[PDB]
Structure 1
Amino acid sequence: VTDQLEDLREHFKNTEEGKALVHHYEECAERVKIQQQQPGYADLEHKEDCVEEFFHLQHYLDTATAPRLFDKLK
């Protein structure tokens, strides 16, 4: 018996909206990776992160999974 919540998050990462949101987060993750490899990163004090893109994804998942999860639990 696998975790009901991680099970719901997987299903919803697979919808059109889900796939789109992880894509947007993914593009950011890549853009960030390339910035970290470049020389001089350590001293920029205005570095980009992907919390925002991650939050949009997580918010979508939460909105879909929240009302369904408890039906899958005792």
Structure 2
Amino acid sequence: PDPAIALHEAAAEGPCHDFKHHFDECVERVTKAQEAEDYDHAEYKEDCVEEFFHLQHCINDNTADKLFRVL
């Protein structure tokens, strides 16, 4: 299988754990907010792109070299 799957998972649980938790908490909040009614007629709809970027940027920093080493 794709080596990246394992490397990415390892990096999320390990060096990028703070960011993983931030993204998770964000998702929880947003899903809950979407669950609540009159969400469609709200001014500000929060997303989790920011937290996702912080996590992905982190995973990539801890993985890029390792991945290319096994291809």
TM-score (norm 2): 0.90
Structure 1: state its 5+ residue gaps. none
Deviations 1:14-62 (A, max 9, x none): 21x3221111011111111111111110111420000000110000001
User: Hey, what does 1:13 align to over in structure 2?
Assistant: 12
Query: Number of residues paired by the alignment?
Result: 71
Find the partner of 1:28 among 21, 26, 29.
Answer: 26
Distance 1:49 1:41 in 2: 13
Which runs of at least 4 in structure 1 moved beyond 2 Å after TM superposition? none
Assess if the C-alpha contact under 8 Å between 2:13 and 2:20 holds in 1: no
Distance 2:48 2:61 in 1: 20
Distance 1:12 1:35 in 2: 29
Structure 2: state its 5+ residue gaps. none
Distance 1:14 1:28 in 2: 17
Distance 1:48 1:60 in 2: 22
SS at match of 1:7: helix
Distance 2:5 2:53 in 1: 17
Aligned-pair identity in percent equals 44
TM-score (norm 1): 0.86
TM alignment of 1:40-59, pairs within 5 A: 40-59=38-57
